[PDB]
Structure 1
Amino acid sequence: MENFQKVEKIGEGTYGVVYKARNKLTGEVVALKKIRTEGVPSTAIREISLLKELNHPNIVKLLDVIHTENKLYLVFEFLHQDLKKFMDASALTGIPLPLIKSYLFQLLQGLAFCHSHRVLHRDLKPQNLLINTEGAIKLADFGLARAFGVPVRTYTHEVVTLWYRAPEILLGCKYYSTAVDIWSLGCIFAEMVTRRALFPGDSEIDQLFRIFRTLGTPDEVVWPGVTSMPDYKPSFPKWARQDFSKVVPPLDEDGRSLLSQMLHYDPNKRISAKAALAHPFFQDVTKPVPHLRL
């Protein structure tokens, strides 16, 4: 608390507020996430702490986990900018295609690693993705769903952002699979390409219907078991799937085919991170460096 000095606020997420903070002693600059409460569920501390042992080049390092005074703090290594800011900064020009492809490849590498270790993110979004000057991108802030779970808002007086949420989550499924992170990454991939969010829903039903309007209202043919899910209603309007050409123009067909496999309704048909890494879209992948304004 007094062992840092706040530099800036970085942002506000689903599970808390994030600050750029300088360690008073070592000079170290870190990203510090603050979550405010009866006091804490203590079960999480063991499993959140377990994430300190996630070690991989595409995952933002979790340095410490500290529970004190009705607060839970997560200390992360500091990266140079998040993807949301970079995308906004790139809005007029666009992120160069080879850089998009490098970022997607790297994000899949980090996911394939987490997933092989049975660790799901469940909240992916551009604010959760961090980049540096040498061209790396990293995923941050896993767990925190399997650990806490969420109400109408994030923590205090912020709504949940629905834009990246898998349909099976929106339909009320109690058991999530790693497939939910693939859906989120697919939505983010589309957004990097077109420079607009793919499914910008303002409510849970608006989110669902925006998905349906594009991809077609799911049924038992394309998604066995869909009509028996907790929040499914037979009264959903029936939209026909649109031609996929309008979704990520003008990405090439390898890109479109990969996105289409990331956006399958049935979590069982949805491509894995490991299989995605082998898709022909990545045959030519390189590692360019971004132009960042810090």
Structure 2
Amino acid sequence: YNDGYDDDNYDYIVKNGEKWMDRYEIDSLIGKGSFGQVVKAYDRVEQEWVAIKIIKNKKAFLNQAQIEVRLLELMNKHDTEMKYYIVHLKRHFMFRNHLCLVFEMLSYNLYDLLRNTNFRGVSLNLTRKFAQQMCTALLFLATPELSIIHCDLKPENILLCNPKRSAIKIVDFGSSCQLGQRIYQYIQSRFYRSPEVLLGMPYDLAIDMWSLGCILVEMHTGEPLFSGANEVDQMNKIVEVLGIPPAHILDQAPKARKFFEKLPDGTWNLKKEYKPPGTRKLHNILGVETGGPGGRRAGESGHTVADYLKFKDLILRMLDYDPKTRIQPYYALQHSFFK
């Protein structure tokens, strides 16, 4: 495999201490994903640490990463001071037949953060700082000349800049696309998949906002909001909480009959054991009146009934079935949850 350097999976086999192009000293493996690996390395030229994303030596992942490159460079045109919470790509090169993207060094992802809470959540206060940043970032993505849909937002793809501050950035634009290129279908990570994509419908940048809604709940409860084991399980879990989608959407939806049928009165309903539509209330998931998630924030400052109600209202606005009315970054930042 690649002269001895690659494993079965088409990944580069790392050796600590290795020096690349008399420039980068590879310190260690940070983590793996589908696209391959990220290693910690020292750049002797710029005299800083970098995270190097090493793409699998395979056409599918390579082509995907070149898309990521194009988009990242595009974003870096607009954001010259790194203000808009998108990881910075410094440069890229080929090396032992693997594309390598060189990023600024960040810290843990919000999933790993959640795992150190034992999946019991972080504070609403911290949830709010994540929210504010994330909404700002979605606002940047929606600048006309970018019009970028991340398409794979989840806690895994959101990293702290460092372990002590609440600053974050979004990573991983490998599944990303600009508005209008609608050739992809069955996109997003299932748990965070928007109704429009589930239903096979045209989609736009609002699908990220759906993802974000899911994420912010999960950041406070510690738990995925809508943990489907497949698309049917997923649409059903959404319907538990938010009820049957509006009829004017299902009428237009190619995949409507993957989850719904019509009753004799001509109205849409499910096919198939779950709680009845809209009875799994976000009011109880968040524990607005009941001390927060699992009652664990009873008495704790910043977790009042009032505060939970603001938060609930923001979320329901992000989880609007209708992509037209779903809250948009700008007005999400104007929400009373952030006053």
Q: Where on the TM-score scale, by shorter chain, does this alignment land: which range?
A: 0.7 to 0.9
Q: Distance in 2 between matches of 1:216 and 1:118?
A: 30
Q: Distance in 2 between matches of 1:202 and 1:60?
A: 30
Deviations 1:246-277 (A, max 9, x none): 23222611110110000011111110011100
Contact 2:121 2:223 in 1 (8 A): no
Contact 1:52 1:64 in 2 (8 A): no
Question: Counterparts of 1:140-289 in structure 2 under 5 Å?
Answer: 140-142=171-173, 144-146=175-177, 161-173=189-201, 175-220=202-247, 224-233=248-257, 234-235=260-261, 236-237=270-271, 239-242=276-279, 243-249=281-287, 250=292, 252-283=308-339
Distance 1:92 1:261, change over 3 A: closer
- The aligned residue for residue 33 of structure 1 is 53
Distance 1:92 1:142, change over 3 A: closer
Give 1:13 deviation, angstroms.
3.7
Q: Distance in 2 between matches of 1:59 and 1:129?
A: 9
Give 1:23 deviation, angstroms.
2.7
Distance 1:246 1:79, change over 3 A: same
Give 1:143 deviation, angstroms.
5.4
Q: Distance in 1 between matches of 2:185 and 2:245?
A: 27
Deviations 1:225-261 (A, max 9, x none): 3233222204443742123322322261111011000
Residue identity matched to 1:248: L
- The aligned residue for residue 137 of structure 1 is 168
Q: Distance in 1 between matches of 2:282 and 2:70?
A: 44
Structure 1 unaligned blocks of 5 or more: 155-159, 284-294
Shifted more, 111-120 versus 2-11: the winner is: 2-11
Q: Distance in 1 between matches of 2:49 and 2:121?
A: 30
Q: Distance in 2 between matches of 1:15 and 1:129?
A: 16
Contact 2:148 2:176 in 1 (8 A): no
Question: Counterparts of 1:121-132 in structure 2 under 5 Å?
Answer: 121-131=150-160, 132=162
Contact 1:119 1:143 in 2 (8 A): no
Contact 1:200 1:207 in 2 (8 A): yes
3-state DSSP of counterpart to 1:228: coil
Question: Would you say how many aligned residue pairs link Structure 1 and Structure 2?
Answer: 273
Q: Distance in 1 between matches of 2:200 and 2:311?
A: 30
Indicate which of 9, 16, 23 corresponds to 2:29. Answer: 9
Q: Distance in 2 between matches of 1:208 and 1:70?
A: 41
Give 1:211 deviation, angstroms.
1.2
Contact 1:258 1:276 in 2 (8 A): yes
Give 1:150 deviation, angstroms.
7.3
Q: Distance in 2 between matches of 1:96 and 1:74?
A: 34
Identity within the alignment, %: 33
Structure 2 unaligned blocks of 5 or more: 1-18, 262-269, 293-306
Q: Distance in 1 between matches of 2:37 and 2:231?
A: 23
Contact 1:120 1:143 in 2 (8 A): no
Q: Rg larger in 1 or in 2?
A: 2
Q: Distance in 2 between matches of 1:12 and 1:212?
A: 34
RMSD: 3.0
